[PDB]
Amino acid sequence: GHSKMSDVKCTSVVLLSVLQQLRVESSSKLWAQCVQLHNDILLAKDTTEAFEKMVSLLSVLLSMQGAVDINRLCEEMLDNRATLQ
């Protein structure tokens, strides 16, 4: 679809918990939509264009599934970005 496998081998429980907390399907892009987007923060161009991606997942998930822990991943991967700049 979009280039290749954006590293969808369940990196960090900080995504995964918040998906399995509801009803996520491995089979449905939704699983991967979070798993890969984590990396794509630290692998973003810059700071601003990193968290710009994460602020576009929490709203997509919580609309479909109403998760709670969705800010945990953000305040991890944003801070692991900021340490690099």
Side-chain angles (χ1 to χ4, degrees), residues 35-77:
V35 173
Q36 66 108 98
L37 206 156
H38 180 260
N39 323 302
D40 284 354
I41 308 312
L42 301 183
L43 284 46
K45 294 280 230 173
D46 304 283
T47 302
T48 184
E49 204 178 277
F51 96 107
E52 272 273 299
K53 323 196 193 177
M54 77 183 71
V55 178
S56 283
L57 58 65
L58 75 183
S59 197
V60 78
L61 288 336
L62 267 52
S63 174
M64 96 95 175
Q65 77 206 92
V68 280
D69 289 83
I70 206 70
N71 280 255
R72 275 85 204 82
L73 49 137
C74 298
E75 306 211 281
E76 191 164 299
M77 65 203 177

Short mmCIF file of all heavy atoms in Angstrom, two decimals, residues 35-77:
data_model
loop_
_atom_site.label_atom_id
_atom_site.label_comp_id
_atom_site.label_asym_id
_atom_site.label_seq_id
_atom_site.Cartn_x
_atom_site.Cartn_y
_atom_site.Cartn_z
N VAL A 35 0.81 0.80 15.91
CA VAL A 35 2.11 0.14 16.10
C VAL A 35 3.19 0.89 15.32
O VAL A 35 4.20 1.26 15.90
CB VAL A 35 2.02 -1.35 15.72
CG1 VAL A 35 3.40 -2.05 15.74
CG2 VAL A 35 1.11 -2.14 16.68
N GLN A 36 2.96 1.12 14.02
CA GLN A 36 3.99 1.75 13.20
C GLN A 36 4.13 3.24 13.50
O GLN A 36 5.20 3.81 13.35
CB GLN A 36 3.71 1.51 11.72
CG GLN A 36 2.44 2.15 11.13
CD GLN A 36 2.78 3.31 10.21
OE1 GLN A 36 2.81 3.15 8.99
NE2 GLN A 36 2.98 4.49 10.77
N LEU A 37 3.03 3.92 13.86
CA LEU A 37 3.02 5.38 13.95
C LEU A 37 3.88 5.83 15.12
O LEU A 37 4.51 6.87 15.01
CB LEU A 37 1.59 5.88 14.02
CG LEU A 37 1.42 7.32 13.49
CD1 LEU A 37 -0.02 7.54 13.03
CD2 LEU A 37 1.85 8.38 14.50
N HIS A 38 3.99 5.00 16.17
CA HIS A 38 4.96 5.15 17.25
C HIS A 38 6.34 5.41 16.68
O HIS A 38 6.91 6.48 16.91
CB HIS A 38 4.92 3.88 18.12
CG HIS A 38 5.86 3.84 19.31
ND1 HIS A 38 7.07 3.17 19.36
CD2 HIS A 38 5.63 4.37 20.55
CE1 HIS A 38 7.58 3.35 20.59
NE2 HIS A 38 6.73 4.05 21.35
N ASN A 39 6.85 4.49 15.86
CA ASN A 39 8.18 4.64 15.28
C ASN A 39 8.23 5.93 14.47
O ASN A 39 9.21 6.66 14.53
CB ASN A 39 8.61 3.51 14.35
CG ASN A 39 8.16 2.13 14.79
OD1 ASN A 39 8.47 1.67 15.88
ND2 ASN A 39 7.39 1.46 13.95
N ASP A 40 7.19 6.19 13.68
CA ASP A 40 7.15 7.32 12.74
C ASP A 40 7.15 8.67 13.47
O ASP A 40 7.31 9.69 12.80
CB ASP A 40 5.95 7.21 11.77
CG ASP A 40 6.12 6.18 10.64
OD1 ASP A 40 7.22 5.58 10.48
OD2 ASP A 40 5.16 5.96 9.86
N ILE A 41 7.02 8.71 14.81
CA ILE A 41 7.29 9.89 15.63
C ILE A 41 8.81 10.09 15.70
O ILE A 41 9.33 11.12 15.27
CB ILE A 41 6.69 9.73 17.06
CG1 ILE A 41 5.21 9.33 17.11
CG2 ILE A 41 6.86 11.00 17.91
CD1 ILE A 41 4.28 10.14 16.22
N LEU A 42 9.56 9.11 16.23
CA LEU A 42 11.02 9.22 16.39
C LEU A 42 11.72 9.27 15.02
O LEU A 42 12.81 9.82 14.88
CB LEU A 42 11.55 8.05 17.23
CG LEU A 42 10.94 7.96 18.65
CD1 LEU A 42 11.59 6.81 19.42
CD2 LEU A 42 11.11 9.26 19.45
N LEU A 43 11.07 8.72 13.99
CA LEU A 43 11.51 8.68 12.60
C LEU A 43 10.83 9.80 11.79
O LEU A 43 10.85 9.77 10.56
CB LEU A 43 11.21 7.29 12.02
CG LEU A 43 12.15 6.13 12.44
CD1 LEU A 43 12.49 6.03 13.93
CD2 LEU A 43 11.49 4.81 12.04
N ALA A 44 10.21 10.79 12.46
CA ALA A 44 9.69 11.97 11.80
C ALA A 44 10.83 12.85 11.29
O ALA A 44 11.98 12.71 11.71
CB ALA A 44 8.81 12.77 12.74
N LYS A 45 10.50 13.84 10.46
CA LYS A 45 11.43 14.87 9.99
C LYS A 45 12.06 15.64 11.15
O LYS A 45 13.27 15.84 11.16
CB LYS A 45 10.67 15.87 9.11
CG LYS A 45 10.12 15.30 7.80
CD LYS A 45 11.19 15.20 6.71
CE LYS A 45 10.65 15.85 5.43
NZ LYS A 45 11.68 15.96 4.38
N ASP A 46 11.23 16.09 12.09
CA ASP A 46 11.55 17.10 13.10
C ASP A 46 10.76 16.77 14.37
O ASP A 46 10.15 15.70 14.45
CB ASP A 46 11.15 18.51 12.61
CG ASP A 46 11.78 18.90 11.27
OD1 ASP A 46 12.98 19.26 11.26
OD2 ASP A 46 11.08 18.89 10.23
N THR A 47 10.71 17.67 15.35
CA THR A 47 9.80 17.60 16.49
C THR A 47 8.35 17.78 16.05
O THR A 47 7.52 16.91 16.28
CB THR A 47 10.14 18.68 17.51
OG1 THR A 47 11.47 18.57 17.95
CG2 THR A 47 9.20 18.59 18.71
N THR A 48 8.05 18.95 15.49
CA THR A 48 6.69 19.40 15.27
C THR A 48 5.95 18.40 14.38
O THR A 48 4.88 17.92 14.74
CB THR A 48 6.75 20.86 14.77
OG1 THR A 48 5.47 21.40 14.61
CG2 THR A 48 7.61 21.07 13.51
N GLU A 49 6.58 17.97 13.28
CA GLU A 49 5.98 17.01 12.36
C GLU A 49 5.93 15.59 12.96
O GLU A 49 5.25 14.72 12.41
CB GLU A 49 6.69 17.07 10.99
CG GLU A 49 5.76 16.56 9.88
CD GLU A 49 6.39 16.65 8.49
OE1 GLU A 49 6.35 17.73 7.87
OE2 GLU A 49 6.78 15.58 7.95
N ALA A 50 6.61 15.32 14.08
CA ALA A 50 6.47 14.08 14.82
C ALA A 50 5.14 14.09 15.56
O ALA A 50 4.29 13.24 15.30
CB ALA A 50 7.62 13.86 15.81
N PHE A 51 4.95 15.00 16.52
CA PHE A 51 3.76 14.92 17.37
C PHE A 51 2.50 15.25 16.56
O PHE A 51 1.43 14.71 16.85
CB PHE A 51 3.92 15.75 18.65
CG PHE A 51 3.35 17.14 18.60
CD1 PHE A 51 2.17 17.43 19.32
CD2 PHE A 51 3.97 18.13 17.83
CE1 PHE A 51 1.61 18.71 19.24
CE2 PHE A 51 3.40 19.40 17.74
CZ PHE A 51 2.22 19.70 18.45
N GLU A 52 2.64 15.99 15.46
CA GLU A 52 1.59 16.15 14.46
C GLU A 52 0.99 14.81 14.01
O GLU A 52 -0.21 14.75 13.75
CB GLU A 52 2.15 16.92 13.27
CG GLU A 52 2.01 18.45 13.46
CD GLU A 52 0.64 18.92 12.97
OE1 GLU A 52 0.35 18.74 11.76
OE2 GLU A 52 -0.18 19.37 13.80
N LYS A 53 1.78 13.72 13.94
CA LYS A 53 1.24 12.41 13.61
C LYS A 53 0.48 11.83 14.81
O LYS A 53 -0.59 11.25 14.63
CB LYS A 53 2.32 11.42 13.14
CG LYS A 53 3.44 12.00 12.28
CD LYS A 53 4.26 10.95 11.52
CE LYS A 53 5.51 11.68 11.01
NZ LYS A 53 6.46 10.80 10.32
N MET A 54 1.02 11.91 16.04
CA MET A 54 0.41 11.24 17.19
C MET A 54 -0.94 11.85 17.54
O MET A 54 -1.89 11.14 17.86
CB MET A 54 1.33 11.18 18.42
CG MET A 54 1.48 12.47 19.23
SD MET A 54 2.63 12.34 20.62
CE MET A 54 4.24 12.25 19.80
N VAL A 55 -1.06 13.17 17.40
CA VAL A 55 -2.30 13.91 17.63
C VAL A 55 -3.35 13.55 16.55
O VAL A 55 -4.53 13.86 16.68
CB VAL A 55 -1.93 15.40 17.74
CG1 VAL A 55 -3.16 16.29 17.94
CG2 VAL A 55 -1.00 15.62 18.95
N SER A 56 -2.97 12.79 15.53
CA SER A 56 -3.86 12.25 14.50
C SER A 56 -4.10 10.74 14.65
O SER A 56 -4.71 10.14 13.76
CB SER A 56 -3.30 12.61 13.12
OG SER A 56 -3.60 13.97 12.85
N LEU A 57 -3.72 10.10 15.78
CA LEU A 57 -4.15 8.75 16.08
C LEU A 57 -5.09 8.72 17.27
O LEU A 57 -6.09 8.03 17.26
CB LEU A 57 -3.04 7.72 16.19
CG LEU A 57 -1.92 7.93 17.20
CD1 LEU A 57 -2.29 7.92 18.70
CD2 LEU A 57 -0.91 6.82 16.92
N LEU A 58 -4.84 9.49 18.32
CA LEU A 58 -5.64 9.33 19.54
C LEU A 58 -7.13 9.57 19.26
O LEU A 58 -7.98 8.88 19.81
CB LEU A 58 -5.08 10.23 20.65
CG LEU A 58 -5.41 11.72 20.47
CD1 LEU A 58 -4.78 12.56 21.57
CD2 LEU A 58 -4.90 12.29 19.18
N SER A 59 -7.43 10.45 18.31
CA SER A 59 -8.75 10.86 17.91
C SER A 59 -9.35 9.78 17.00
O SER A 59 -10.55 9.53 17.07
CB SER A 59 -8.62 12.22 17.19
OG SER A 59 -9.86 12.90 17.10
N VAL A 60 -8.53 9.11 16.18
CA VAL A 60 -9.00 8.06 15.30
C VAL A 60 -9.37 6.82 16.13
O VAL A 60 -10.45 6.26 15.94
CB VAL A 60 -8.05 7.81 14.09
CG1 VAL A 60 -6.76 6.99 14.31
CG2 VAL A 60 -8.82 7.11 12.97
N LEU A 61 -8.53 6.44 17.10
CA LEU A 61 -8.82 5.28 17.94
C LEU A 61 -10.02 5.58 18.81
O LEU A 61 -10.99 4.84 18.77
CB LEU A 61 -7.63 4.86 18.83
CG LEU A 61 -6.42 4.19 18.14
CD1 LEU A 61 -6.73 3.52 16.80
CD2 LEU A 61 -5.31 5.20 17.85
N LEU A 62 -9.98 6.64 19.61
CA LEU A 62 -11.01 6.87 20.63
C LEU A 62 -12.38 7.11 20.01
O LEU A 62 -13.38 6.94 20.72
CB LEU A 62 -10.63 8.07 21.51
CG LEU A 62 -9.86 7.67 22.78
CD1 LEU A 62 -8.64 6.79 22.48
CD2 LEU A 62 -9.40 8.93 23.52
N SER A 63 -12.44 7.47 18.73
CA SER A 63 -13.69 7.55 18.00
C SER A 63 -14.23 6.14 17.78
O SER A 63 -15.41 5.88 18.02
CB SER A 63 -13.41 8.31 16.70
OG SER A 63 -14.51 8.36 15.82
N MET A 64 -13.38 5.21 17.34
CA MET A 64 -13.79 3.85 17.01
C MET A 64 -13.97 2.97 18.25
O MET A 64 -14.76 2.03 18.18
CB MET A 64 -12.83 3.24 15.97
CG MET A 64 -11.68 2.36 16.49
SD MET A 64 -12.15 0.60 16.47
CE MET A 64 -10.64 -0.27 16.98
N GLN A 65 -13.25 3.24 19.35
CA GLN A 65 -13.10 2.31 20.48
C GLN A 65 -13.07 2.90 21.89
O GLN A 65 -13.24 2.13 22.84
CB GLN A 65 -11.86 1.44 20.26
CG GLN A 65 -10.48 2.07 20.54
CD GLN A 65 -9.38 1.39 19.73
OE1 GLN A 65 -9.07 1.83 18.63
NE2 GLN A 65 -8.80 0.28 20.18
N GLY A 66 -12.87 4.20 22.07
CA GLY A 66 -12.92 4.85 23.38
C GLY A 66 -11.92 4.29 24.40
O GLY A 66 -12.33 3.89 25.49
N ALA A 67 -10.63 4.25 24.05
CA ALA A 67 -9.56 3.81 24.95
C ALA A 67 -9.22 4.88 26.00
O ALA A 67 -9.55 6.05 25.80
CB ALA A 67 -8.32 3.53 24.10
N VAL A 68 -8.48 4.50 27.05
CA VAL A 68 -8.10 5.40 28.15
C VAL A 68 -6.61 5.78 28.09
O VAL A 68 -6.29 6.96 28.00
CB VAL A 68 -8.55 4.82 29.51
CG1 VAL A 68 -10.04 5.12 29.74
CG2 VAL A 68 -8.35 3.32 29.70
N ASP A 69 -5.69 4.80 28.08
CA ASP A 69 -4.21 4.91 28.12
C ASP A 69 -3.60 5.59 26.87
O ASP A 69 -2.39 5.50 26.65
CB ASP A 69 -3.64 3.49 28.35
CG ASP A 69 -3.88 2.94 29.76
OD1 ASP A 69 -4.99 2.41 29.99
OD2 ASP A 69 -2.98 3.02 30.63
N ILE A 70 -4.37 6.31 26.05
CA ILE A 70 -3.91 6.76 24.73
C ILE A 70 -2.90 7.90 24.82
O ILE A 70 -2.23 8.21 23.84
CB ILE A 70 -5.11 7.08 23.80
CG1 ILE A 70 -4.78 6.93 22.30
CG2 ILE A 70 -5.68 8.50 24.02
CD1 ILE A 70 -4.56 5.49 21.84
N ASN A 71 -2.81 8.56 25.97
CA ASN A 71 -1.84 9.62 26.18
C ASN A 71 -0.51 9.04 26.66
O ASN A 71 0.50 9.73 26.54
CB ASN A 71 -2.39 10.66 27.16
CG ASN A 71 -3.36 11.61 26.47
OD1 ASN A 71 -3.03 12.76 26.18
ND2 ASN A 71 -4.56 11.15 26.14
N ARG A 72 -0.48 7.79 27.14
CA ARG A 72 0.77 7.20 27.64
C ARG A 72 1.81 7.17 26.53
O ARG A 72 2.90 7.71 26.71
CB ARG A 72 0.56 5.80 28.25
CG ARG A 72 0.13 5.83 29.71
CD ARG A 72 -1.39 5.99 29.84
NE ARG A 72 -1.79 6.58 31.12
CZ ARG A 72 -1.79 7.89 31.40
NH1 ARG A 72 -1.33 8.77 30.51
NH2 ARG A 72 -2.25 8.32 32.56
N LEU A 73 1.46 6.59 25.38
CA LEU A 73 2.38 6.49 24.26
C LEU A 73 2.88 7.87 23.85
O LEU A 73 4.08 8.00 23.61
CB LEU A 73 1.81 5.73 23.05
CG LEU A 73 0.40 6.13 22.58
CD1 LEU A 73 0.28 6.22 21.05
CD2 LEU A 73 -0.63 5.13 23.11
N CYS A 74 2.01 8.87 23.78
CA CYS A 74 2.36 10.21 23.35
C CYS A 74 3.46 10.79 24.23
O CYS A 74 4.51 11.17 23.70
CB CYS A 74 1.12 11.10 23.31
SG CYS A 74 -0.02 10.39 22.09
N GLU A 75 3.25 10.81 25.54
CA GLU A 75 4.21 11.42 26.46
C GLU A 75 5.47 10.55 26.64
O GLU A 75 6.44 10.99 27.25
CB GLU A 75 3.52 11.74 27.80
CG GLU A 75 2.26 12.60 27.58
CD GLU A 75 1.95 13.55 28.74
OE1 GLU A 75 1.40 13.12 29.78
OE2 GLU A 75 2.17 14.78 28.59
N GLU A 76 5.50 9.33 26.08
CA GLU A 76 6.73 8.56 25.94
C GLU A 76 7.45 9.01 24.67
O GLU A 76 8.54 9.59 24.73
CB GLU A 76 6.45 7.05 25.98
CG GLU A 76 7.77 6.27 26.09
CD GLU A 76 7.59 4.81 26.52
OE1 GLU A 76 7.06 4.56 27.64
OE2 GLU A 76 8.08 3.91 25.81
N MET A 77 6.87 8.76 23.50
CA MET A 77 7.55 8.93 22.23
C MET A 77 7.83 10.40 21.89
O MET A 77 8.80 10.66 21.18
CB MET A 77 6.79 8.18 21.12
CG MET A 77 5.39 8.73 20.85
SD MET A 77 4.27 7.52 20.09
CE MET A 77 2.78 8.53 20.02
#
